[PDB]
């Protein structure tokens, strides 16, 4: 339950979430928890443009997710997660951040490679099977992390 973000960020979250989110309480709770669990992530609001051209200001959480120093070869991916205004009824959506990143620094051996489309959107299995009543933002990033991980050593 320890909070890693400073007061200015908590107050900011309080402020920006209110006007946008159908369920501000859950969005605030899940966003704060995410930031507290993944210290490389930061929040901002940005305009997301929908498929039909409609722009919508949304909370976005961004940063570089990296495998831990656990003896395995390190892998990192810069991502941008968007929280839709109907969260958690609707799932977040996540893309690779294409600044200073070449999507081709990701081994085809990495399980995550399979889920990244030509446009940079990451179709994580958890998002496809989203359960509004049982899932949160942390679980999304945890799955992302588990797919970045070097696949286990075998003896073949």
């Amino acid at each position: 339950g320890k909070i890693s973000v400073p007061e200015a960020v908590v107050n900011w979250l309080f402020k920006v979430i209110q006007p946008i989110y159908n369920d501000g309480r859950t969005t605030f709770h899940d966003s704060l928890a995410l930031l507290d669990n993944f210290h490389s992530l930061r929040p901002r609001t940005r305009v997301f443009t929908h498929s039909d051209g409609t722009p919508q200001l949304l909370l976005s959480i961004y940063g570089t997710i990296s495998t831990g120093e656990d003896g395995s070869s390190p892998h990192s991916i810069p991502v941008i997660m968007w929280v839709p205004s109907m969260y958690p009824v609707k799932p977040p959506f996540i893309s690779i951040n294409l600044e200073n990143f070449d999507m081709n620094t990701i081994s085809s051996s990495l399980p995550i490679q399979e889920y990244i489309d030509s446009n940079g959107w990451i179709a994580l299995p958890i998002l496809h099977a989203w359960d509004p009543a049982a899932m949160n933002l942390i679980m999304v990033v945890q799955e992302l992390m588990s797919l970045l991980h070097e696949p286990p050593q075998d003896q073949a």
């Binding site: 920006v16 006007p19 901002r44 609001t45 200001l57």
Partner: peptide, 8 residues
């Protein structure tokens, strides 16, 4: 509101 960023 317009876009904002407590870090930038």
């Amino acid at each position: 509101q317009v876009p904002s960023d407590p870090y930038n």
